[PDB]
Amino acid sequence: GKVIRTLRLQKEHWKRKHHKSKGIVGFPTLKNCEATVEKIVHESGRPAPLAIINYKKEEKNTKGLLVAIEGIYEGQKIQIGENASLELGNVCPIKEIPEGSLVSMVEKKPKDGGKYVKSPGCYATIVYHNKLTNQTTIKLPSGERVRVTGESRALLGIIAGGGKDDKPLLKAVNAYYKYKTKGKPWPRVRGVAMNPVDHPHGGGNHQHVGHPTTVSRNAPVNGRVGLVAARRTGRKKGSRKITVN
Amino acid sequence: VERQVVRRGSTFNTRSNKRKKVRTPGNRLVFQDVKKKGKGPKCGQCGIKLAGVKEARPAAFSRMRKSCRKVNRILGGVQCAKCVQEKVLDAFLNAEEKRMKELE
Amino acid sequence: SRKTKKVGITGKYGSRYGSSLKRRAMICMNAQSKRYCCSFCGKTTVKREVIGIWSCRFCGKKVSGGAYVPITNQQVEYKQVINRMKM
Amino acid sequence: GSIKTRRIKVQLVSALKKNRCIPQWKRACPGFKQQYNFTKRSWKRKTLKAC
Amino acid sequence: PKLNRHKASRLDKKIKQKKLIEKPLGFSSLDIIKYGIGHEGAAKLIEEAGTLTFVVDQRADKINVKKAFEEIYGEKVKKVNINNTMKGVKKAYIRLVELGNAAVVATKAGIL
RNA sequence: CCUCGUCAUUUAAAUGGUGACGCGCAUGAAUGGAAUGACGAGAUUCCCACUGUCCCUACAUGUAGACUAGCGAACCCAUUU
RNA sequence: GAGGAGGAGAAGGGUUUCUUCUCAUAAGAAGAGUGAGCCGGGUCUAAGCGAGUGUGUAGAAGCAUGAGCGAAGGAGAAACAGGUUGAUAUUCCUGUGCCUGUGCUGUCGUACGGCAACGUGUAUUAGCUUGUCGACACGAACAUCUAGACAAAGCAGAAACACCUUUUCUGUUCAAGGGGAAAAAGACCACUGAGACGGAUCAUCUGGCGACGUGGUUUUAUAUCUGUGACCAGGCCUGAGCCUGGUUUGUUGAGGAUGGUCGUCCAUGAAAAGACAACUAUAUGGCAGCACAGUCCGUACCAACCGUAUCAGGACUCCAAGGUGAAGAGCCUCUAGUGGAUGUUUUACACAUGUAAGGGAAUUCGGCAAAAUGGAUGCGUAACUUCGGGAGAAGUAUUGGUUCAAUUGUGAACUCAUUGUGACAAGGGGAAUCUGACUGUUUAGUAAAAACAUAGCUUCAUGAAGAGAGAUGAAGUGAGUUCUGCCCGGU
RNA sequence: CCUUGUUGCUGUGAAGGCUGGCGAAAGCCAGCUGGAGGCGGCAAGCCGUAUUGAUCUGCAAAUCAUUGGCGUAAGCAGGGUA
Numbered sequence A: 001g002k003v004i005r006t007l008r009l010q011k012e013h014w015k016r017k018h019h020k021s022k023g024i025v026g027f028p029t030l031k032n033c034e035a036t037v038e039k040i041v042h043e044s045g046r047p048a049p050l051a052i053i054n055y056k057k058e059e060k061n062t063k064g065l066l067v068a069i070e071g072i073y074e075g076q077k078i079q080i081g082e083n084a085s086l087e088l089g090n091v092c093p094i095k096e097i098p099e100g101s102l103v104s105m106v107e108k109k110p111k112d113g114g115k116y117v118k119s120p121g122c123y124a125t126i127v128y129h130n131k132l133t134n135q136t137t138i139k140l141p142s143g144e145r146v147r148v149t150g151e152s153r154a155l156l157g158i159i160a161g162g163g164k165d166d167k168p169l170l171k172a173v174n175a176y177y178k179y180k181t182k183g184k185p186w187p188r189v190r191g192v193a194m195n196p197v198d199h200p201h202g203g204g205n206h207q208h209v210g211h212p213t214t215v216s217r218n219a220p221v222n223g224r225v226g227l228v229a230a231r232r233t234g235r236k237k238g239s240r241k242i243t244v245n
Numbered sequence B: 001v002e003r004q005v006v007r008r009g010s011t012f013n014t015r016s017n018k019r020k021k022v023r024t025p026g027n028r029l030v031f032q033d034v035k036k037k038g039k040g041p042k043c044g045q046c047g048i049k050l051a052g053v054k055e056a057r058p059a060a061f062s063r064m065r066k067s068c069r070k071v072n073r074i075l076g077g078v079q080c081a082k083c084v085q086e087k088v089l090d091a092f093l094n095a096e097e098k099r100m101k102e103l104e
Numbered sequence C: 001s002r003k004t005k006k007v008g009i010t011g012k013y014g015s016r017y018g019s020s021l022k023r024r025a026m027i028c029m030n031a032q033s034k035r036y037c038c039s040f041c042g043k044t045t046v047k048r049e050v051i052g053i054w055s056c057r058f059c060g061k062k063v064s065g066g067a068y069v070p071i072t073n074q075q076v077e078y079k080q081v082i083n084r085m086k087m
Numbered sequence D: 001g002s003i004k005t006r007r008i009k010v011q012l013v014s015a016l017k018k019n020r021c022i023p024q025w026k027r028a029c030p031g032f033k034q035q036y037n038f039t040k041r042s043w044k045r046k047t048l049k050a051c
Numbered sequence E: 001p002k003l004n005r006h007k008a009s010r011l012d013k014k015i016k017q018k019k020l021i022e023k024p025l026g027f028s029s030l031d032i033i034k035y036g037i038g039h040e041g042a043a044k045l046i047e048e049a050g051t052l053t054f055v056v057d058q059r060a061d062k063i064n065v066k067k068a069f070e071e072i073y074g075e076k077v078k079k080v081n082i083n084n085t086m087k088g089v090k091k092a093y094i095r096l097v098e099l100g101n102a103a104v105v106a107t108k109a110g111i112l
Numbered sequence F: 001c002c003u004c005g006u007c008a009u010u011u012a013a014a015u016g017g018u019g020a021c022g023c024g025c026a027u028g029a030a031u032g033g034a035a036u037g038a039c040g041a042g043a044u045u046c047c048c049a050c051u052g053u054c055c056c057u058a059c060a061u062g063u064a065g066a067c068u069a070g071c072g073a074a075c076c077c078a079u080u081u
Numbered sequence G: 001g002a003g004g005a006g007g008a009g010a011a012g013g014g015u016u017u018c019u020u021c022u023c024a025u026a027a028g029a030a031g032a033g034u035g036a037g038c039c040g041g042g043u044c045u046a047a048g049c050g051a052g053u054g055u056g057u058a059g060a061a062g063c064a065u066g067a068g069c070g071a072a073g074g075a076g077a078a079a080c081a082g083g084u085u086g087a088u089a090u091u092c093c094u095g096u097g098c099c100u101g102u103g104c105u106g107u108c109g110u111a112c113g114g115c116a117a118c119g120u121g122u123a124u125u126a127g128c129u130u131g132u133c134g135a136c137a138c139g140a141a142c143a144u145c146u147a148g149a150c151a152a153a154g155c156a157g158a159a160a161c162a163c164c165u166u167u168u169c170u171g172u173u174c175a176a177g178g179g180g181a182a183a184a185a186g187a188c189c190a191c192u193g194a195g196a197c198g199g200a201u202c203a204u205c206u207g208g209c210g211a212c213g214u215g216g217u218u219u220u221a222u223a224u225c226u227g228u229g230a231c232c233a234g235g236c237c238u239g240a241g242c243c244u245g246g247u248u249u250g251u252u253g254a255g256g257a258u259g260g261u262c263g264u265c266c267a268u269g270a271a272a273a274g275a276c277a278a279c280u281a282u283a284u285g286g287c288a289g290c291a292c293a294g295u296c297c298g299u300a301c302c303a304a305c306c307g308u309a310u311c312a313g314g315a316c317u318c319c320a321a322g323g324u325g326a327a328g329a330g331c332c333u334c335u336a337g338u339g340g341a342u343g344u345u346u347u348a349c350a351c352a353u354g355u356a357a358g359g360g361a362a363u364u365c366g367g368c369a370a371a372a373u374g375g376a377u378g379c380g381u382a383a384c385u386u387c388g389g390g391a392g393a394a395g396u397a398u399u400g401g402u403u404c405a406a407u408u409g410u411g412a413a414c415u416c417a418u419u420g421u422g423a424c425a426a427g428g429g430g431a432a433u434c435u436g437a438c439u440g441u442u443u444a445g446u447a448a449a450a451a452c453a454u455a456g457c458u459u460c461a462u463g464a465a466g467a468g469a470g471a472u473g474a475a476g477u478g479a480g481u482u483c484u485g486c487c488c489g490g491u
Numbered sequence H: 001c002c003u004u005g006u007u008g009c010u011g012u013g014a015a016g017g018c019u020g021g022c023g024a025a026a027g028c029c030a031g032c033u034g035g036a037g038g039c040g041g042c043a044a045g046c047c048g049u050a051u052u053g054a055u056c057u058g059c060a061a062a063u064c065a066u067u068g069g070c071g072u073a074a075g076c077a078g079g080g081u082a
């Protein structure tokens, strides 16, 4: 047969375009700074708003981008790095923040610029500090617990734009605007409605799959469709998670 | 009623192709071209349009007298009277706190 | 105002889309269109520019917020925790 | 149409000078055996491909 | 950089070298002018508007034509207009600083 | 499948339609099952209005067609029919 | 019949355009014709392409970086009237101008005013830095201006006259550049000190972070004047020149322009070249006259384009009068443009159409085709339903001309030989069942659907990112309501 | 994907607002204002249901007539680019 939809959309001419982008998002590199928030802006592909910051490096003014936490305003002064106060919207070394606190834009290793929590409405929880090893345990929004060194930086607050998934998209055109900038195929034609030249689920005198939909992790790429390496299937209840800090 | 032709350029009704109808001394009704409108300066702090300055397109603005492009104050065009009053006060009041923190 | 018994702001849609879905949309649609109170000047002149960004029509201040309301439930609580940390 | 490039114009100018019959004096010359100029064209029957 | 140059107005491109011997007089007044045109079309222009019409070499430009006329014929020039015709000929029209002199120059030169 | 299943209603008359019944050759639950609203150039049955669809055809108009001037082809063809 | 069979541009064509001659004619031959500092190209940058260099390959492809390139409809210094040819004209000629630079001669300059909002003064180069202009979605209502269209009066010329008529028609012009209001809509400054209350919009709204009031400051059109006279109409003569007019008011009004408001979005709606202000230094700088300069390429014509053609097909745009009517609908007219295979009254069978006694689907697989209904105003409106709808449900009545009242609600009278949305335009309606929720999409050329899509629902995999779990990908079912039992033996 | 062009006439009357009445309250009933919608009837346009009409040595190697579907928008279109 021919090449399936899933492979074609991974070729280079289909990658997302950057022409409307504001810049690369991430923290400054300097040990200490005082910054001012210049503007709060929407960026074409992203639902969380961005804040433009201004800080001096040598004598010269320089500009950066952060993801906005909820409760900043244009004109606010913010303090970055060691010796910053625990005030909403400051950036601090993680070892300085008390247990049970909520944080965003956490660095996985020092000076990486911030990864981890970046989507609207999300946060992470500080669950443990180890005074020997200088590690800290953070609980991520998937439920995963990960350990990071005390020298990493983090932003104090919750990411702006929460609640967005409460309102249903009642019409086809509303879905159109949401997926127009994403990589997923919309509208999505079902594999059982294709001919066998186009998809492993195609063909036959009734619309059916005909073979089990759970497939191996090591299966060849042009036929790896369906539920890939599923441990279980169906709507029944699972089992207890195992937890360590 | 007499009807018009496009004398020059394209028929395609873009922003650069505005026209108006005019009556000539020879008693003809003809199309004649129109230049675009101009926006003048807005304040750098608040977005308000500055008083005392003209609105024109960049080339035409540069050919006017300097008096059309400024007011005679600390920031010429640039900022409005309220924003300069705030700036003058702020710089004064900050220096006095530093004076006190130096003396005490 | 209020010429309808149940349907409220969703009357624009006629008999299309499901009943249950419309009454979820309604909560958000009523919240989006209201004016709210400014923290800086006290007036009730704050409205939404775009998702996450709220703005005052008198004094011009812009502030980060939720998608359909200026302050979300998580924020109203967490703001208090910070005030205690400062003690 | 009215807008042309320099390269297109020279092609038209050359295509217009070549489009002529055999001059009437040549037919009288002892050694000359042509009847009609087979390179003559009509705008109704052929394209130049000047584009 | 190499490009097909299909939209260009000048068909030459290359910069020219020096040579061990150089051609005697160069592009010069007597290469520039070919002949003046005298017919019922041209006659009106001499009689009404004080302008002569001439055929000129393909390599010529407005500045060169102005000089060449003042060298060969001697009257002073106000304006030069140029026209590439469908017959492959470049025509120049020259208006003189004083009218009336157009009929003097035309008759001496045997154009008219 | 047997099958134009049996009983009721619609017609003068029902291999049709609707309502009931059910050991259902071989119905059935996201290979999705069941009951409605609004909307289909979607499939099907009936009633009112309306009529050359029909009983059963008649007359009239325009344009071609027949005959005439100018212009002027093709398919096909073992051919004695 | 002004959403033209009218007048023009682009893409495409390439002399098809103008004059003369000849039939050879959608045919030839011989000549002639396209003039720019101000119109467009040559400039800037979009999405993107890429020489060389590095890495790779037997040579290539590919991948990293990147000089140069990339829009005749995006950004982009400066021109308009009137004349003239057989054929060109914001390009030629006359008149009045403007932009960017250069040089001569005169003539002045090295600062002030207002409590303030800000003003007076045509002002040099250069540089940091901070900001502005270039520089921007859709939809709705309301103002103001300009084209356009009407109606009265005046004059000049036309049409019509068996009768009647101050009936009817055509005209009444003012460019770029220069000078310039009142008005309307917003900002702001000084005094003043307001509420269970005042102000204000068609609508929202607005005030001690300063209301109403009284005086000012500033931004944004247009009318009007000048543009030194051109141009038009008419009369008298004429192989040419003279003479007379071009005057007043009201109503309406964009399918063009502009202004400040309001709404929508899990959608927030380009860059760069080139400019300008403030701050800091530095100063022979401003204005008037006169003079000089501004290269190169395109410029005719199309009813002539693509379909083997002089082909009922296809093909990007601009301007647009009067009546009827809600209406650039249909029907009728003004401006401007238009047409040929010949004669014969011409049977039958056709193809486009009209009408029909009595009966009314008996016709046929099947009411297929046709008929019937039709606009506006009022009365009156069921089951069911997600409470929005169903709904124009169904069912009924009215409608012309004239002469009055009354002022938007409409009433009343008189009149006609079949009656009045008179032509043109203009829904048939109800009761049920199967099926897909809805608008949307599809087999260019035998299938438009119950098929595909869709919102919603459920499952799966991952902490890797220029992306970071309200995330990113893979499958299945098909809106909403109500349910979704049992089986891990085989694969 | 980048830069552009193209909405005329009418019906229904959501959210928000103002008056008057009723109520001890909460909030109910009238009339007016406002103008939402992949909402209705049409125009320019885009399409292709029926007559199994005309044509089938065609006007045409897919056209024509009447009749239909949508037409304030998951609508239609030129150029540049992949």
Ligand SMILES: [K+]
Residues within 6 Å of the ligand: A179, A180, A181, A182, A183, A184, A185, A186
């Ligand atoms: K997508």
Ligand SMILES: [K+]
Residues within 6 Å of the ligand: A193, A194, A195
């Ligand atoms: K299929």
Ligand SMILES: [K+]
Residues within 6 Å of the ligand: A192, A201, A202, A203, A204, A207, A208, A209, A210
């Ligand atoms: K299958």
Ligand SMILES: [K+]
Residues within 6 Å of the ligand: A207, A208, A209, F031
């Ligand atoms: K299935």
Ligand SMILES: [K+]
Residues within 6 Å of the ligand: none
């Ligand atoms: K099976």
Ligand SMILES: [K+]
Residues within 6 Å of the ligand: B052, B053, B067, B068, B069, B070, B071
């Ligand atoms: K000023």
Ligand SMILES: [K+]
Residues within 6 Å of the ligand: D001, D003, D004, D051
């Ligand atoms: K061309």
Ligand SMILES: [K+]
Residues within 6 Å of the ligand: D043, D044, D045, D046, D047, G013
């Ligand atoms: K041709």
Ligand SMILES: [K+]
Residues within 6 Å of the ligand: F004, F015
């Ligand atoms: K039976």
Ligand SMILES: [K+]
Residues within 6 Å of the ligand: F014
């Ligand atoms: K029966």
Ligand SMILES: [K+]
Residues within 6 Å of the ligand: none
């Ligand atoms: K079964």
Ligand SMILES: [K+]
Residues within 6 Å of the ligand: F028
């Ligand atoms: K089954």
Ligand SMILES: [K+]
Residues within 6 Å of the ligand: none
């Ligand atoms: K099941």
Ligand SMILES: [K+]
Residues within 6 Å of the ligand: F040, F041, F042
């Ligand atoms: K249908």
Ligand SMILES: [K+]
Residues within 6 Å of the ligand: none
């Ligand atoms: K007949």
Ligand SMILES: [K+]
Residues within 6 Å of the ligand: none
């Ligand atoms: K005949």
